[PDB]
Structures are given as C-alpha cells and as structure tokens.
Design a protein around this ligand. Structure first.
Ligand SMILES: Cc1nc2ccc3ccc(CNc4ccc5c(c4)CN([C@@H](CCC(=O)O)C(=O)O)C5=O)cc3c2c(=O)[nH]1
Ligand SMILES: Cc1nc2ccc3ccc(CNc4ccc5c(c4)CN([C@@H](CCC(=O)O)C(=O)O)C5=O)cc3c2c(=O)[nH]1
Ligand SMILES: *c1cc(=O)[nH]c(=O)n1[C@H]1C[C@H](O)[C@@H](COP(=O)(O)O)O1
Ligand SMILES: O=c1ccn([C@H]2C[C@H](O)[C@@H](COP(=O)(O)O)O2)c(=O)[nH]1
Lengths: 295, 295
C-alpha cells in the first residue's frame, strides 16, 4: 500500500522530472540518477508483488530458479513459456554485438553463471561448470550459518572480465545481505540491499523487486531466519517513452495490500526449491497493462 | 554544512539506535544496515571535506593516485609518510589470514589492481601488469567521451575470485558514473554513486567521501565536464566502540562551510595528476581527533 505507493511516486517523479535522453535501443527514455531507495518490509510473510498491475510471478520464480542452477541457456525458460530473454538471446541480437559464433539462446556468462562460478572460464551454456570459479551463493549460506554478522555477504554478477561475452551485462549487479540481531527474543531477521545500475521502471523493476524478495525469503528459510527488509537502490532509473501512457493509467489506480508468501515442503537446501514450493496467498491485482520490451 | 550535518546526524543515530554486534577485529561496534544515502553537491567547486574534524587530505590524494597507478604495495605509501595500510600489510596480519608466502607490504590484488587490471592473474606487487585484465577506468573515460549516456559506467574492485588473495576485501566496492544532459546551456555534469559494503563512520567514511568526490572531479575534468553530485550508499554502516568517545563531542562542534577544489595545470589525462595539481582552498577544520585503527 504505502510501500507500493513509493514505486508509483517514483514513476510520477520520472515522468515529471526525468531527463530526456538518447537510448541505445533507439527508443526514448525519461531518466533520473540515484533516486531515493525503495524499501519493502518482508515481515508477517508480506511479499512485495505489485497490485496496481498484474505481475506474472511464475516467470519470476522460474528465472530465479534458473539463476540458482547456474544456467545461461534462455531456451530453458522459453520451454516454459517465459520469453523475456528470447530477444537478447536471438541470432540477430547476438550478431549485432559481435557474438557471431554463439548459438541462439546462449546468453553467455550472465547472472547464474557468475553467482555460482564467478571467475570460471566460460565455454557455452551446455557445459558442466561444477567446481569451477567461486560459488558466491553457497558461500553466503555457509557464512550466514557460521558468522551471521559477517560484513561480506555479497552476491555479485558484475564481472568486468566477462562483460564482452554476455548478451546483456547485469542490470541487478549485486546485493548485500545482513542478518539482524534478535529483537526482543524473536528469530533473527535477514535483510537484503540490491544495487541495480539500470532500471526499466515500467517492465523490469516490478519483477526485480519480486525476484530479490523471493531470494531473500528462500535464503532466510534455509538458514532458519525470518525475512527482514528488502532495499532497492537504483542507478539510472528510467521509463521508456512508449510506456508512459500505460504508466499514467496505472498511476490512476490505488494500491491494494500485498499478498503473503509461504515456503512450503520444508525445503532445507537452496538448490532444492521448485516452482510448487512457493505459496502466494491473497494476491488481488488490477488488470494487466501491456508494456513492450525495447530490446 | 547541512551536507556535513547528514553525516553527523547519522553518527548520532547509530550511537543511539545502532545494533550492538560482535566484530572480527574483536572490538565491538554499533551498526545500522542500509541507512539513507548521503548526498553531496560538487557544484560551485564545492569539495566535501569534513570540517568538524581535520581530514588528512594529503593521504586521501596520495592513496587515490596510488589506486590509479594500479599499485598494491603499501610501502609506496609508507615512503610518503602515509601509514593507514601498514597494519594490513604486516607480516603478522598477513599470516593471520593465511598469506604466509606474501612479502610484507604486498596487499594483494586490491582496489587499484582491480580498477586497472580486473581479471589479470596476480603475482606480486612488483610485477608489470600492463595490458593484462580489464582497465575499467580507461574504459569509463572513453565511454564518457564517446557515448556519455551509457548505463554501464561502472568502476568495481569487487572480485570474488581474488578475495582470498587480498589483505582486505574492498570496503568501497564499486561506483557508477552518470553524465547529465546539459541544463540551460552549461557544460554537462558528471555524478557518482558509490556503494560501500562496510563503513567505519569514524575513520574511513570521511576519507572515502573525499576520495570519491576527488575521483569524480578528476574524471569530469579530463572529460571536459563539470562535477555534479556524489551519492554515498551504505550497507553495514557502523561505529567502533573505542571511537564513540571522540565522536559524541565531534557532534558538539558546528560544521563550517566546505572548501572548494580547483584542478589546474590543465592535466588532460587521468594518469597525469600529481599532488600539486590539486588546489583545495579555504579548508579550515576544527582540531584533529585521534582515532585508532582496528587491524
Ligand atoms: C529494455 C528491457 N530489456 C530487458 C531484457 C532482459 C530482461 C530479463 C529479465 C527482466 C526481469 N525479470 C522478468 C521475469 C519474468 C517475466 C518478465 C521479467 C516479464 N514477463 C512478461 C512477458 C515477457 C515478454 O515480454 O516477452 C509478462 O508480462 O509477464 C515475465 O514473464 C527484465 C528484462 C528487461 C527489461 O526490463 N527491459
Ligand atoms: C578498522 C579499519 N581498517 C581500515 C583498513 C584500511 C583502510 C584503508 C583506507 C581507508 C580510507 N583512506 C585513508 C587515507 C589516508 C589516511 C587515512 C585513511 C587515515 N589517515 C591517518 C593516519 C594513518 C594511520 O591510521 O596509520 C590519520 O589520522 O591521519 C590517513 O593518513 C580506511 C581504512 C580502514 C578503516 O577505516 N578502518
Ligand atoms: C574499509 C576500507 C575503507 O576504505 N573504508 C572503511 O571504512 N573501511 C573499514 C570498514 C571496516 O570497519 C574495516 C574492514 O572490515 P571488513 O572487511 O568489513 O570485515 O575497515
Ligand atoms: O532484470 C533486469 C534486466 C534488465 N533491465 C532493463 C534495464 C534497461 O532498460 C535494459 C538494459 O539495458 P542497458 O542498461 O544495459 O543498456 O534492460 C531491468 O530493468 N531489469
């Protein structure tokens, strides 16, 4: 409600004050740099899925599960009717950035590969990288359980050495987790601060918010913690000019309270979650608003 | 002033509401996660060098220049009578973290090495790394002069694959630059958003604020831009206990206006700056306050 209003207020702010700038995708964008971070409480099982707009949660979970497996083949998502990566993985796109010998769908060493094998030599999206590079995610879980107050709980996909091999350099670049000391005598809280260098407010941001709120909830669950807060920090925060009209109608809408999230099945290893382990109760959004990706 | 007040209000807030938590150094700390970012305007040549406590700006400049040369030998700083890195480079500390074969002073592939040679194989602090790895800094300067509105102007020292080799993992992890469109008809401004995963509010933060304001001014200067804003985002923001004493009073001192900075001699290349090229004027801080480091 008020939390969702933050997002809506940022959208209105960019519409009314964003700088008009030239985009690589030819389309126009209104943009603001370093706006105040968005904050979402994950307490009481609350889950930050926007209500003023239908948010396809299934694809969010599938993408996260795919990242966790260290996968980089977009066909794995396409096989499940998730097409967000089809454009950046297309033969045409790949050739436009000089990746003429990359099979279609092989996005390169993006999120998943960096999260699980940072530093490993990338070959293709069919190779088994077990044991290569550093498994940041496993390391984070292990540290949380061993020295939860550690100040190095970083999960990062930003690898300068691999950028030229990626179909798209990471937008959600890195996040930091923090375990809070027990309030009163409750279960410790796990918070997450995400830094996103480039944020497509109309299309991407709602999914990214959900994505990290889920990840935080998953790692909290597997570590016997309760989820605390999700903090979304943004660099170039923008709106594609062909989304304005639609956002302005979304802006006339009133936020309903967020749904809740229950992690069922009692999963105990981050790698064990599956689509059906996620229980989102009481999600009642307004209709869906069509917002086309600008590739 | 009001800008310096942000810092002061944060110090006091941590003193009063910060979580008490065990530290690796053994000392205790008061800490808060993801407090509101501090923002500093670099317009009108304003340089955010704290006045409520004399900041060793010569040490700030020399460390920055050392970072830019891609240096990792703390002795280079020691020769100039700058000692902040001596402890982390000592035989004792080095061995304490398992670097028993590392020569004293050889910090490993930290900041400067990552900035100019990300991904290169680190050997020691006396090896010539020219041409190895990714020169993020040169790439940023070239992108600004080529396609300023690029959303990928990132400078990062966070390299999971090299963390174990570092005497200390990066505190100021990465920053993102943003070139604003011209306002009215004045020269475009360059802004910088820094993400610091762990901030020693008492000792480090004032130096880091100064350090990144300087870098921003330097890149802008060589790219024919004017400086815009410096935004400091923080993860685990803390105060060391053995520092609270010397900080509660600093909170009694009223902030004077910040000095100004002029970069002269017409340096036109980022690797050409030297100490005398920095002209900090009207810097008049209160007495210097002794604050011990926690190895
Ligand atoms: C310009 C631009 N390009 C992108 C390229 C790749 C992306 C990959 C992931 C995400 C964020 N994550 C998800 C995860 C799942 C879905 C969606 C986004 C969008 N989505 C659409 C349909 C996808 C389609 O447009 O092809 C829907 O309305 O539900 C999902 O199923 C955003 C982008 C952007 C993006 O936001 N903007
Ligand atoms: C616990 C802790 N450890 C650190 C380890 C390495 C660091 C490297 C750089 C900076 C930030 N940059 C500078 C750059 C120059 C100076 C100082 C800090 C501190 N300083 C001291 C003298 C050096 C000393 O402490 O030995 C002074 O009070 O003038 C300077 O000359 C902070 C740390 C911290 C830090 O702030 N805290
Ligand atoms: C690290 C280096 C710097 O430039 N600035 C800082 O404030 N610090 C501080 C943070 C922390 O107190 C200590 C590093 O400890 P850790 O790696 O976070 O565990 O130095
Ligand atoms: O999870 C994601 C991935 C991408 N983007 C958007 C941001 C940009 O509009 C475009 C990436 O383009 P560059 O910033 O790299 O140009 O995709 C997001 O918002 N979220």
């Amino acid at each position: 409600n008020a939390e969702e209003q933050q997002y809506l207020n940022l959208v209105q702010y960019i519409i009314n004050h964003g700088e008009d700038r030239p985009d690589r995708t030819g389309t126009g964008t209104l943009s603001v740099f370093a706006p105040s971070p968005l904050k979402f409480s994950l307490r009481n099982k609350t889950f930050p899925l926007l209500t003023t707009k239908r948010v396809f949660i299934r694809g969010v979970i599938e993408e996260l599960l795919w990242f966790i497996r260290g996968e980089t083949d977009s066909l794995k998502l396409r096989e499940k009717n998730i097409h967000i990566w089809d454009a950046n993985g297309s033969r045409e796109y790949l050739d436009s950035i000089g990746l003429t010998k990359r099979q279609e769908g092989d996005l390169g060493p993006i999120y998943g590969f960096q999260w699980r094998h940072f530093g490993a030599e990338y070959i293709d999206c069919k190779t088994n990288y077990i044991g290569q590079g550093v498994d940041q995610l496993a390391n984070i879980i292990q540290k949380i359980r061993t020295s939860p107050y550690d100040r190095r709980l970083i999960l990062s996909a930003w690898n300068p050495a691999d950028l030229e091999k990626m179909a798209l350099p990471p937008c959600h670049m890195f996040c930091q987790f923090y375990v809070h000391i027990p309030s009163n005598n409750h279960r410790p809280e796990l918070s997450c601060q995400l830094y996103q260098r480039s944020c497509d407010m109309g299309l991407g941001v709602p999914f990214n918010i959900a994505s990290y709120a889920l990840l935080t909830c998953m790692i909290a669950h597997v570590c016997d913690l309760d989820p605390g807060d999700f903090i979304h920090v943004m660099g170039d925060c923008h709106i594609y000019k062909d989304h304005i009209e639609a956002l302005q109608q979304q802006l006339t809408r009133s936020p309903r309270p967020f749904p809740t999230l229950s992690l069922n099945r009692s999963i105990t290893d981050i790698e064990d979650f599956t689509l059906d382990d996620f229980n989102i109760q009481n999600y009642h959004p307004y209709e869906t608003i069509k917002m086309k990706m600008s590739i």
